Each structure stands twice: as structure tokens, then as C-alpha cells.
């Protein structure tokens, strides 16, 4: 389920699971996944099956990842690759573009029979710049990944959370991992908390 909102002339959904649906664009945009970060005790599988609702779920004719697909070198492991071939085979139309983070480059761009179109930051999709890490762009507003932005609620529970800015905003960590950025609670910026969207 779903957040709508207004932002530089565009309806963009803010999904509960931690994506942005822009139904102009028929499009999917997420950031930070990091498959290959997965602990022993979350999963790679759980990613891409949580992937699978989400395009189930939308009209997505493309997706679009802000940096940070595989995580490190032993994510390019015979059996983790695998399990993203077999996941790309079952979405054989859907377009996947990746914007190349700091783990995309280490790591170095996904094999090529998977079908991955990789771009270099900016990616601009009128009216916005798509990129990994979040640098103010010479003209245009950017939606950007690559800080994990969650936030702190106390009564500590680290949310993670979209960012929505005029300038820079931020989508939150794909991946299912403890820390992040924590986003200040004086932002002059709109907060969404993807546990519903919950607005601040
Ligand atoms: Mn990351
Ligand atoms: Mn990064």
C-alpha cells in the first residue's frame, strides 16, 4: 500500500517497502539493495520474492536501481549470481537499469548475461536526475540512494525513510540491514517512514 504525493510536477507513489512507483514512467525505483549482503541466521531469495511483489503489484515497464546492486566481490558467487539470473529470466521484458554506486563499481558491472543496462550518474528522467550518491545536480532535482536514510524515533527505533526535497531527495536502503544515515529530526524536508507511509 501506498503513499501518493506531489513533487516537481510529478505523482510519485511512496510504497511501504521501501521503493518509489512513478506511474507516468511505469517505473520502479529503489536504491542501496546490495544483494551478496546477506547473513547466515534478509536472504538473497527474500530480496528478489520481495522485488517480485512489488512488480506484481505495479505496471512497471522498467526498474530502476540508484546504486548498490551487488554488494562486493563475493557477491559475483556462483550460486548468488544464480539466483539473480534466474530472477531477471522471469521478468524477460521488464527493463533494469543500474545506476553504478561505489559497489557497482568495486564489484564491477553485472555480467552481461543478465541483461542489466548500466548507466553513470546523473540519469536524468524528466524532470529528475537519478543517482546514486546525493549530489546537488547543476539544474535539476535529484533522487538519490547510496546514505540508507532512516530515522530515529525513541519512547531507540531506527525507521528507514524517504527524504523528499526540493534539491536532493533520498530513497531509503533496499537491503535489509541494521544502521543508516540517521536523517536529522530539523529537516526542512518532507519525511516519510516506511515501516502504510507514515508522514514524519
Ligand atoms: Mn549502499
Ligand atoms: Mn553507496
Known amino acids: 500500500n501506498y503513499q501518493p504525493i506531489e513533487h516537481r510536477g510529478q505523482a510519485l507513489w511512496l510504497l511501504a517497502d521501501k521503493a518509489?512507483?512513478?506511474?507516468?514512467?511505469?517505473?520502479?525505483?529503489?536504491?542501496?539493495?546490495?544483494?551478496?549482503?546477506?547473513?547466515?541466521?534478509?536472504?538473497?531469495?527474500?530480496?528478489?520474492?520481495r522485488?517480485?511483489?512489488?512488480?506484481?503489484?505495479?505496471?512497471?515497464?522498467?526498474?530502476?536501481?540508484?546504486?548498490?546492486?551487488?554488494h562486493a566481490r563475493?557477491?559475483?558467487?556462483?550460486?548468488?549470481?544464480?539466483?539473480?539470473?534466474?530472477?531477471?529470466?522471469?521478468?524477460?521484458?521488464?527493463?533494469?537499469?543500474?545506476?553504478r554506486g561505489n559497489h557497482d563499481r568495486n564489484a564491477g558491472?553485472?555480467?552481461?548475461?543478465?541483461?542489466?543496462?548500466?548507466?553513470?550518474?546523473?540519469?536524468?528522467?524528466?524532470?529528475?536526475?537519478?543517482?546514486?550518491?546525493?549530489?546537488?545536480?547543476?539544474?535539476?532535482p535529484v533522487l538519490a540512494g547510496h546514505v540508507h536514510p532512516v530515522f530515529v524515533l525513541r519512547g531507540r527505533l531506527r525507521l528507514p525513510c524517504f527524504v523528499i526535497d526540493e534539491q536532493v531527495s533520498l530513497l531509503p536502503a533496499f537491503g535489509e540491514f541494521t544502521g543508516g544515515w540517521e536523517i536529522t529530526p530539523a529537516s526542512a524536508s518532507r519525511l516519510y517512514l516506511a515501516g502504510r507511509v507514515w508522514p514524519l
Open 109 to 140: 558491472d553485472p555480467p552481461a548475461s543478465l541483461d542489466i543496462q548500466v548507466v553513470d550518474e546523473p540519469w536524468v528522467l524528466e524532470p529528475f536526475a537519478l543517482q546514486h550518491e546525493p549530489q546537488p545536480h547543476g539544474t535539476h
Open 20 to 49: 518509489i512507483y512513478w506511474p507516468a514512467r511505469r517505473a520502479l525505483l529503489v536504491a542501496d539493495v546490495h544483494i551478496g549482503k546477506a547473513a547466515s541466521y534478509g536472504t538473497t531469495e527474500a530480496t528478489l520474492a
Open 51 to 70: 522485488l517480485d511483489r512489488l512488480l506484481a503489484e505495479h505496471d512497471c515497464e522498467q526498474l530502476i536501481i540508484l546504486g548498490d546492486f551487488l
Open 74 to 99: 563475493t557477491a559475483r558467487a556462483p550460486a548468488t549470481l544464480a539466483k539473480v539470473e534466474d530472477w531477471r529470466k522471469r521478468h524477460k521484458n521488464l527493463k533494469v537499469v543500474l545506476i
